[PDB]
Amino acid sequence: TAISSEKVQITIKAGKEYSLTANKDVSVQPSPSFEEMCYQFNALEIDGSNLNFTNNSASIDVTFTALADDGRKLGYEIFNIPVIQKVKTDNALTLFH
C-alpha cells in the first residue's frame, strides 16, 4: 500500500511530453490516509509553440497517473484542454442587401 511521491507523475502532450514528477513539484506532502491524498503542484509553464492548428484549434492532454511501489498502477485520469486561435486575415461577414 506504500505510495512513493517519486512514482506519482504527470505527462502533458503539447507537441512533446513534458514529464513532471510530484517529488520536486509538491510543496508539502499530504498525510498518509486511505481517504484522500491531495497533491498540490506548482506553477507549470507550457510553451505555446509546437501546437498544430487544424480548423484553427489545438488540444493539450494532461495525463494524471499513479504507480504503487511494487510496480502496479493505481489508475490514470487523462484530461483534455482545447486551444482555439483567432485568425486575422478573414474579414467579418457582411450582409449584402
Binding site: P30, S31, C38, Q40
Partner: protein, 97 residues
C-alpha cells in the same frame, strides 16, 4: 500558528486544506426543499403518472434518471456511481423532528 506547535495536539492529528474556494451545494440549507423537489420528487411523479397511463418505456427512462441498476454511461465512459441523486449516496437528515 508556527512556533513548533503552539497548539498541542492531544486528540488532534493534523491541519490541512489551504486551496479551496467554492464548496459543493447543500441539501440542508435554506433552498434545500426546492432541490429535493427538482431532483427526486419530479422524476418520481412523472414516472408514477406515466405508469398509470400504460405508457411503459417512457416511464422506464424516467425512472432511470434516479436509480439505474445497469450503471450510467456518460460520453462513452461507464461511471462508478449507482444512484443519481447525491444525498441518496450520503444520508443527510434534512428534518430533525
Amino acid at each position: 500558528d508556527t512556533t513548533y506547535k503552539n497548539g498541542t495536539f492531544p486528540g488532534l492529528a493534523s491541519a490541512r486544506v489551504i486551496q479551496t474556494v467554492s464548496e459543493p451545494m447543500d441539501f440542508s440549507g435554506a433552498n434545500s426543499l426546492y432541490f429535493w423537489e427538482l431532483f427526486y420528487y419530479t422524476p418520481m411523479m412523472v414516472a408514477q403518472r406515466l405508469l398509470h397511463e400504460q405508457n411503459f418505456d417512457e416511464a422506464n427512462r424516467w425512472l432511470k434518471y434516479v436509480w439505474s441498476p445497469s450503471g450510467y454511461i456518460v460520453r462513452g465512459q461507464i461511471k462508478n456511481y449507482h444512484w443519481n441523486v447525491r444525498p441518496l449516496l450520503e444520508n443527510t437528515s434534512w428534518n430533525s423532528d
